[PDB]
């Protein structure tokens, strides 16, 4: 099951609230692999606390590194269900406009965009 099916809306709002109290400077992010994905591996965890000062470009590099990919492997990251308009935008700005109602910022990745 996906993160949203795993935890109730109430539980998600609560997780976000706790992250605000304990990690004020981090953006609560949910990163999941596309269900049809075959090449790309699954991450070790689902929710991440990303320093609010990094832009999407750096986050992509971070994710690629956590996945231990090589320069030849394709990587595409969807935010709030759609592709990113700008990769130079600070995640703090991205959060304010693409955040889910429960408070988390959802991302999905796959080999083909």
The rounded distance, in Å, linking the Cα atoms of 31 and 42 is: 10
Closest CA to 89 of 102, 98, 101: 98
Query: How many CB atoms sit inside 10 A of residue 48's CB?
Result: 18
Number of domains forming the structure of the chain: 1
Strand partners, 31: 107
CATH number at residue 24: 3.10.20.90
Strand partners, 90: 55
Domain residues for the domain of 8 are 1-113
Instruction: For the chain, give the longest Cα–Cα distance.
Output: 41
Identify how the structure was determined: X-ray
Resolution (A): 2.0
């Amino acid at each position: 099951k996906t993160f949203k099916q795993r935890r109730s809306f109430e539980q998600r709002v609560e997780d976000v609230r706790l992250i605000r109290e304990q990690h004020p400077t981090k953006i609560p992010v949910i990163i999941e692999r596309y269900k049809g994905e075959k090449q790309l591996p699954v991450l070790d965890k689902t929710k991440f606390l990303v320093p609010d000062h990094v832009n999407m470009s750096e986050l992509i590099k971070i994710i690629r590194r956590r996945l231990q990919l090589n320069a030849n492997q394709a990587f595409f990251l969807l935010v709030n269900g759609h592709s990113m308009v700008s990769v130079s935008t600070p995640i703090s700005e991205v959060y304010e406009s693409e955040r889910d109602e429960d408070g988390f910022l959802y991302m999905v990745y796959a080999s083909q965009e």
